[PDB]
Structure 1
Amino acid sequence: MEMEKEFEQIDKSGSWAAIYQDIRHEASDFPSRVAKLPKNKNRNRYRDVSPFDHSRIKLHQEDNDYINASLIKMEEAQRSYILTQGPLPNTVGHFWEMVWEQKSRGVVMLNRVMEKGSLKCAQYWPQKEEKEMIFEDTNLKLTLISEDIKSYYTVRQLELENLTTQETREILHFHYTTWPDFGVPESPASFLNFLFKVRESGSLSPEHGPVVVHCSAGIGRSGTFCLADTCLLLMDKRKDPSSVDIKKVLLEMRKFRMGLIQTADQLRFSYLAVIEGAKFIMGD
């Protein structure tokens, strides 16, 4: 069924809350035993948001391999994403270790450091060229190379150096700075523009490791970003783009990380983004 009219059928009936609860009811439940070990309590921002054991990213160290991060592998779309929480004061070194070990080209950030007067994640990247960051616990160095500030997002070029080998890589930081403190954007125009800028960079492409995507918990805004991208890629690839069922793509993604799309408003916004993104590509 074409999703514009279905969209219109849910909107006219006002059943967004009822669709969203059906998804929550059918979603996968797998164990998260490593996340709940007592040694890992200060590595988790939220007690109710954990990576599943089968899909968690492992750090390449013998001490403690745990980070709150999951690999979302979409087989038919041929895309992979790492979804993770906003780094904590004691996990900033782990975060950059993961970016290095997984060979990521891009980091996508969908939140501000402060929202609603509270800290949503650590200041994990340098703000001035001449004041670089060193993480002694994971032996890495991070330098701001350049910054391009626009109205809805900022793009930064960073240099990440493995102090053990003296190898360096360029990491692109894509920071969406205008998601509102409450609710979802009114138009998906600036979110779709942002997504097309990340694609243009090469960050989502198979010649690199998976892109790292985060918000505060790494399930709501982060969920919206990977659901919209995968759905539009499938519409490009299949003979009949109407076959593409956003609710079925979301349930497949929820086999890899719990809780993706946190509210009925985020579900409606996801539909809007895919429809408009489809209409802008599919002709007019």
Structure 2
Amino acid sequence: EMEKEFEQIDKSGSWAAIYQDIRHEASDFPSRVAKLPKNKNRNRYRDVSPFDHSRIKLHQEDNDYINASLIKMEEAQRSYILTQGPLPNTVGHFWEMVWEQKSRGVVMLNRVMEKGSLKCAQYWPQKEEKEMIFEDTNLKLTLISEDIKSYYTVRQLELENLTTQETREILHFHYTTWPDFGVPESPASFLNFLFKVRESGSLSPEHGPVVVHCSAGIGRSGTFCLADTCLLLMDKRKDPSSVDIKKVLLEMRKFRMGLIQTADQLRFSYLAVIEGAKFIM
């Protein structure tokens, strides 16, 4: 059981060592399409690339590339699209992917500005009356409503296909309080946020996979998916303590490189799941 394994690693301070064994054991697959010169300006970090095998393809004939990965957790019956914070020139692509994958929810785990730099383009409207048109992808986006709370904001948006006049309602879940450095002291607000996404039905198989991002779509995004999948497997299994968070992380890393960027994020994920197990036990 992980609670005991938690104290063990913690008491021994072996987090950096566990973390290194995961780095070593992690899968490595081609990312040939990411590295093509015509895609250079579609990537935010040159060292954060989708594997070819699990990359999301845009349905435009021109260039089908977006820095986005489908993570399929077969046993948990859960899929996630992990992507980078959109660039000024990829906001249109981002909303096209959301449209084409029939996603209900977008989960955002960064602020637009952190440490005095831009981590992300402003890809959603700030006022009801000021909608955004994406000329390249023929999509209109409108803010319908916005519910600002202490730790997070939920924003009801209408995505309209200008080509076909279909509209869909998208939910934007924005965790607004992840600190600039390290990880939250308590996982309580993060778990509350995860349960709010769950309740929305955005994680449900009725819908396309949820789109999850931070700046790179591997660190905070990783923690989100890892916690969701682990808690869900603990419901599904005859023996809940058979769930190995290191095994689960390694399965997710077959789909996108670098999920969980630091030993700090690894520790926080353990804490979140343990506290998660507790809330629902």
Tell me which interval the TM-score lies in, with the shorter structure as reference length. Answer: over 0.9
| Counterpart Cα distance in 2 of 1:12 and 1:41 | 44
3-state DSSP of counterpart to 1:155: strand
Deviation at 1:78, TM superposition (A): 0.3
| Counterpart Cα distance in 1 of 2:201 and 2:143 | 20
Partner residue in 1 for 2:73: 74
Deviation at 1:91, TM superposition (A): 0.2
| Counterpart Cα distance in 1 of 2:254 and 2:103 | 22
Deviation at 1:49, TM superposition (A): 0.1
Partner residue in 2 for 1:55: 54
Aligned length, in residue pairs = 281
| Counterpart Cα distance in 2 of 1:3 and 1:169 | 41
| Counterpart Cα distance in 2 of 1:125 and 1:13 | 45
Deviation at 1:36, TM superposition (A): 0.2
| 1:190-234, Cα deviation, whole Å (9 max, x unpaired) | 000000000000000000000000000000000000000000000
| Counterpart Cα distance in 2 of 1:77 and 1:129 | 37
| 1:136-160, Cα deviation, whole Å (9 max, x unpaired) | 0000000000000000000000000
Partner residue in 2 for 1:278: 277
Deviation at 1:280, TM superposition (A): 1.0
Q: Which runs of 4+ in 1 moved over 2 A?
A: none
| Counterpart Cα distance in 2 of 1:119 and 1:197 | 27
| Counterpart Cα distance in 1 of 2:127 and 2:206 | 30
In structure 1, runs of 5+ residues without a counterpart are: none
Deviation at 1:110, TM superposition (A): 0.2
3-state DSSP of counterpart to 2:81: strand
Deviation at 1:57, TM superposition (A): 0.1
User: What TM-score do the two structures reach when normalised by structure 2?
Assistant: 1.00
| Counterpart Cα distance in 1 of 2:71 and 2:184 | 25
Partner residue in 1 for 2:262: 263
- Identity level (%): 100
Deviation at 1:103, TM superposition (A): 0.1
| Counterpart Cα distance in 1 of 2:164 and 2:46 | 36
| 1:8-29, Cα deviation, whole Å (9 max, x unpaired) | 0000000000000000000000
| Counterpart Cα distance in 1 of 2:76 and 2:106 | 20
Deviation at 1:93, TM superposition (A): 0.1
3-state DSSP of counterpart to 1:169: strand
In structure 2, runs of 5+ residues without a counterpart are: none
User: What TM-score do the two structures reach when normalised by structure 1?
Assistant: 0.99
| Counterpart Cα distance in 2 of 1:260 and 1:205 | 22
| 1:238-261, Cα deviation, whole Å (9 max, x unpaired) | 000110000000000000000000
